[PDB]
Amino acid sequence: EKRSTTTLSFLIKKLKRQKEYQTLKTVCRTCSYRYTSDAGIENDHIASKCNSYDCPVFYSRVKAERYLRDNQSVQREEALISL
Amino acid sequence: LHMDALLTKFNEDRSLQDENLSQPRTRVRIVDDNLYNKSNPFQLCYKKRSQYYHIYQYRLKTFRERVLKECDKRWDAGFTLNGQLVLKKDKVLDIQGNQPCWCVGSIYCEMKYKPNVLDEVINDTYGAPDLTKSYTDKSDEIMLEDESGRVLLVGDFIRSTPFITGVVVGILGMEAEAGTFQVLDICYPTPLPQNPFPATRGKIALVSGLNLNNTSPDRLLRLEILREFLMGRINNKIDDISLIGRLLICGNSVDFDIKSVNKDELMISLTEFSKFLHNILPSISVDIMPGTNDPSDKSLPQQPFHKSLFDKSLESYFNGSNKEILNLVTNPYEFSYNGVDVLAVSGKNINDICKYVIPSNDNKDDIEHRLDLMECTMKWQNIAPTAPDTLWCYPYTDKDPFVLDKWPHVYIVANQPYFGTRVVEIGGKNIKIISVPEFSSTGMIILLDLETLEAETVKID
Amino acid sequence: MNRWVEKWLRVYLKCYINLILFYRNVYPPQSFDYTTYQSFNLPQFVPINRHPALIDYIEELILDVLSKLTHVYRFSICIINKKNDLCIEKYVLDFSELQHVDITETEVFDEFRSSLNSLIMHLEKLPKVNDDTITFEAVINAIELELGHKLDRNRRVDSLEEKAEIERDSNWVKCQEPKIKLTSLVGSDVGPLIIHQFSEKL
Amino acid sequence: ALRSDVNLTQYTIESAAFNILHKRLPHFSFESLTNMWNAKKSTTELKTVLNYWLSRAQINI
Amino acid sequence: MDQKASYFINEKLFTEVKPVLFTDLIHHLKIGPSMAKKLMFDYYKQTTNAKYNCVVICCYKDQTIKIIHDLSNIPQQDSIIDCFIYAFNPMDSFIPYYDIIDQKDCLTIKNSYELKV
Numbered sequence: 067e068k069r070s071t072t073t074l075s076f077l078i079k080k081l082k083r084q085k086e087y088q089t090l091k092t093v094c095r096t097c098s099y100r101y102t103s104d105a106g107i108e109n110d111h112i113a114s115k116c117n118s119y120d121c122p123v124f125y126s127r128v129k130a131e132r133y134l135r136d137n138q139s140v141q142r143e144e145a146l147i148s149l
Numbered sequence: 150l151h152m153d154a155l156l157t158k159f160n161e162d163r164s165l166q167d168e169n170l171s172q173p174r175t176r177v178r179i180v181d182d183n184l185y186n187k188s189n190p191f192q193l194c195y196k197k198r199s200q201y202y203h204i205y206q207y208r209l210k211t212f213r214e215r216v217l218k219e220c221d222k223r224w225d226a227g228f229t230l231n232g233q234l235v236l237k238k239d240k241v242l243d244i245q246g247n248q249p250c251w252c253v254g255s256i257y258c259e260m261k262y263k264p265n266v267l268d269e270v271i272n273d274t275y276g277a278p279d280l281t282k283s284y285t286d287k288s289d290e291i292m293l294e295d296e297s298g299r300v301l302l303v304g305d306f307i308r309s310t311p312f313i314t315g316v317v318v319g320i321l322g323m324e325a326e327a328g329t330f331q332v333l334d335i336c337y338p339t340p341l342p343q344n345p346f347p348a349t350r351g352k353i354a355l356v357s358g359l360n361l362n363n364t365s366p367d368r369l370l371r372l373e374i375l376r377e378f379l380m381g382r383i384n385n386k387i388d389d390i391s392l393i394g395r396l397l398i399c400g401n402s403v404d405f406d407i408k409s410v411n412k413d414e415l416m417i418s419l420t421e422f423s424k425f426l427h428n429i430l431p432s433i434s435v436d437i438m439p440g441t442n443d444p445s446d447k448s449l450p451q452q453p454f455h456k457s458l459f460d461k462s463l464e465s466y467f468n469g470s471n472k473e474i475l476n477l478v479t480n481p482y483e484f485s486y487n488g489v490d491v492l493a494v495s496g497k498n499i500n501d502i503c504k505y506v507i508p509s510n511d512n513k514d515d516i517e518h519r520l521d522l523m524e525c526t527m528k529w530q531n532i533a534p535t536a537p538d539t540l541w542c543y544p545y546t547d548k549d550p551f552v553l554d555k556w557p558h559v560y561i562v563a564n565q566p567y568f569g570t571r572v573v574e575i576g577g578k579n580i581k582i583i584s585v586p587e588f589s590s591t592g593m594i595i596l597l598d599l600e601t602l603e604a605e606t607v608k609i610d
Numbered sequence: 611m612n613r614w615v616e617k618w619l620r621v622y623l624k625c626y627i628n629l630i631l632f633y634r635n636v637y638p639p640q641s642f643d644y645t646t647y648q649s650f651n652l653p654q655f656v657p658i659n660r661h662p663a664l665i666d667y668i669e670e671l672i673l674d675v676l677s678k679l680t681h682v683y684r685f686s687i688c689i690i691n692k693k694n695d696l697c698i699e700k701y702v703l704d705f706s707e708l709q710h711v712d713i714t715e716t717e718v719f720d721e722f723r724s725s726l727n728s729l730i731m732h733l734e735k736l737p738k739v740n741d742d743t744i745t746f747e748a749v750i751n752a753i754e755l756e757l758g759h760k761l762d763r764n765r766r767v768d769s770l771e772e773k774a775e776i777e778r779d780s781n782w783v784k785c786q787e788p789k790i791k792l793t794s795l796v797g798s799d800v801g802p803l804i805i806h807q808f809s810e811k812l
Numbered sequence: 813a814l815r816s817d818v819n820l821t822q823y824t825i826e827s828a829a830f831n832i833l834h835k836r837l838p839h840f841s842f843e844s845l846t847n848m849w850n851a852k853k854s855t856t857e858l859k860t861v862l863n864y865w866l867s868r869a870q871i872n873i
Numbered sequence: 874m875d876q877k878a879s880y881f882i883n884e885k886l887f888t889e890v891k892p893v894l895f896t897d898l899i900h901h902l903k904i905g906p907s908m909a910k911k912l913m914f915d916y917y918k919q920t921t922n923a924k925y926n927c928v929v930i931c932c933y934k935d936q937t938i939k940i941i942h943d944l945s946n947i948p949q950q951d952s953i954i955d956c957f958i959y960a961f962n963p964m965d966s967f968i969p970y971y972d973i974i975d976q977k978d979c980l981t982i983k984n985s986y987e988l989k990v
């Protein structure tokens with residue numbers, strides 16, 4: 067129940083990855099403003115379908131998506147802290 | 150008078166009475182009725198975890214239904230204007246004629262980003278384009294979309310009101326000389342139910358933005374003075390200090406950057422916070438809430454911190470049975486403090502709205518502007534108007550938690566630059582909004598009463 | 611016992627050198643910032659310099675001293691003037707048997723806190739030292755060793771440990787030992803670490 | 813003409829726009845553009861495809 | 874008692890060089906906060922050998938708490954409802970240290986709930 071080193075390291079890794087993903091999503095949402103001229107919802111939806119293989123932000127985006135959609139064993143009620 | 154004269158005047162005439170230390174004054178009891186009842190709305194499953202489109206559709210449908218109810222209640226058939234009768238229109242292309250007409254539709258604004266946010270996201274992406282070009286290559290107008298087009302909301306009533314894109318309204322205006330709709334009155338969603346105000350009673354302490362870091366040593370002395378003040382050591386007026394039934398840290402307990410951080414210094418700050426908690430718990434109850442820069446999820450519905458992340462000296466409080474004295478709570482929560490339903494948010498919704506620059510509302514980062522933003526958040530019945538910035542994938546399915554289903558008595562948005570309170574009257578009801586400032590800089594502590602809802606501040610220098 | 615003492619002694623020496631460099635104006639005070647973490651949990655909010663070269667210099671010096679610890683019984687940070695090479699201040703840190711190889715870290719940090727508080731209280735009473743050609747030095751007093759005589763075999767290195775041993779044996783030169791004013795301070799009386807403090811002026 | 817003048821890798825409209833004009837354009841598949849152009853709702857999608865092709869035609873000049 | 878307190882303060886100020894607070898006297902002598910302030914002021918008196926820096930804080934009206942630094946221009950001396958000595962600092966930089974305290978019987982205010990073990 068008590069573990070403050072490995073669990074906190076896992077939290078640091080997960081939070082770093084989540085902040086990187088949010089930054090990438092914000093960058094794509096700002097880049098998609100050229101066409102949509104919108105800022106609310108459906109702008110992130112229109113920007114989520116950009117498959118421009120000539121942009122380095124796209125490969126990083128799909129890598130972040132693959133990383134977030136995996137490693138479900140660490141992201142659970144038992145993250146080496148048992149609760 | 151000199152400093153020695155003040156000491157000679159005060160300490161020589163010390164009372165040293167009523168300090169028995171054998172029969173200490175019992176703190177006033179303040180309970181949280183939402184501790185065991187059921188269904189915490191903001192408690193999600195992190196293991197379960199674009200999904201934003203379903204939330205968009207649900208918000209649109211619910212808000213349109215509510216605004217249509219309010220309109221049919223206020224713009225009921227027969228409500229004639231000064232000259233002619235007011236008509237009802239289903240689509241935005243049907244409002245065309247020299248006659249009044251009202252319709253329901255969302256709001257479309259510009260909402261461009263601020264330069265500092267763009268610079269940050271560019272410097273933290275490794276390949277971000279010149280995002281400023283997207284705003285300069287392409288302006289200032291509010292429009293109304295209702296699934297069938299848009300019209301320009303011209304006039305004066307539309308300018309003296311803050312708006313955010315996506316919000317639906319019940320515009321009632323008149324087409325004048327082009328495809329530009331005037332505005333005479335605006336409708337908001339129908340008023341929500343509110344629990345009756347209860348009819349001996351104590352107060353609660355509101356603290357936010359401790360920001361315990363490993364570089365600033367001043368933020369620990371203010372915290373120690375706060376620890377000594379709540380225990381009744383500094384003020385010595387146990388007849389009034391014993392009325393602070395609970396303590397509510399509203400987020401931002403530790404300040405760090407997850408870009409460059411390890412487990413050691415975060416553990417140092419967490420042990421400092423745990424020392425504070427262990428020293429203050431035998432005298433007062435604590436309700437800890439996650440923040441924007443704490444070791445928790447970056448989204449808005451942040452789960453409680455952990456049973457870990459605290460020193461092993463607090464293992465007796467986390468055994469499960471001791472929850473009334475220490476309660477790790479979700480980031481948004483509705484505390485039912487002796488019937489006074491208070492909705493508390495760490496303050497990311499307003500801080501995410503303020504990171505935009507809307508080229509409207511002209512006809513600047515002040516306390517009144519943020520209070521107006523909170524009042525509009527309460528008016529629109531949506532805690533997070535900017536969903537893509539605050540919300541995360543899968544907040545809920547078919548029943549969104551941020552769409553308010555019940556108005557609270559006190560609405561707290563913390564981690565704000567300034568402090569300010571405002572009571573607003575929305576459809577015969579009354580909600581008291583409170584803006585809690587950070588404790589790192591301008592270390593004020595808000596004392597909120599529960600018998601009359603009067604907030605007073607306590608500064609610590 | 612060389613198990614945990616090597617970290618606590620490193621932290622103590624880091625705080626010692628940083629406090630001496632800060633309170634004597636050996637480096638500009640703007641390059642210092644009060645902190646608690648410098649890759650090690652510090653016992654106080656110690657002003658630690660954040661210069662890239664100075665940090666590495668201090669770390670290498672402390673590692674060399676800790677390597678030679680088994681024969682060193684005294685460590686001094688001498689403050690020499692620059693207009694003329696003369697020791698105007700000397701802060702001696704005695705290591706009399708150090709209760710070395712032959713423990714509730716909180717107590718160790720409490721003793722270090724007391725020692726550093728004594729050092730700060732002593733340093734805060736000295737007159738202000740002008741910048742612009744004030745500097746410092748480092749002198750140790752060993753029991754039985756001879757440095758600088760390891761490069762007499764061409765010592766073809768195989769890894770980083772041997773290279774470090776060579777460059778630490780070669781980084782020291784020999785030296786020798788009026789109105790002196792000795793002022794004793796508070797040391798560390800914890801079991802494994804029995805340290806004593808001194809000071810010299812004029 | 814761009815292949816003969818400048819020496820870059822892909823020679824697409826987005827790559828040329830970024831390497832010559834320093835403009836980063838999003839790219840949507842032919843099915844996404846079709847789904848946007850057939851959306852009875854979401855005027856944002858129609859504006860999106862219109863500005864998409866308008867920028868593609870303006871960058872050619 | 875004015876005898877145990879003086880010895881404890883002298884020890885924790887000169888032998889174990891550390892800033893001593895009045896809450897330390899509360900925890901060591903099992904006394905109230907007002908009596909601790911009285912003892913701190915009494916130790917501030919009879920101080921022919923003064924080798925410390927007193928840290929004085931004062932509580933104004935409207936519930937404000939300040940730490941006096943200049944000791945020459947005290948703002949709003951008429952609104953002061955209390956002014957006592959907070960700590961004795963031997964050094965210049967205050968920067969105290971806070972550790973775990975077992976407040977088993979030194980509490981003047983207890984919460985309505987009891988710890989369930």
Ligand code: SF4
Nearest residue numbers: 094097116121124838
């Ligand atoms: S990925 Fe490259 S192209 Fe697709 S949006 Fe983000 S920036 Fe624009």
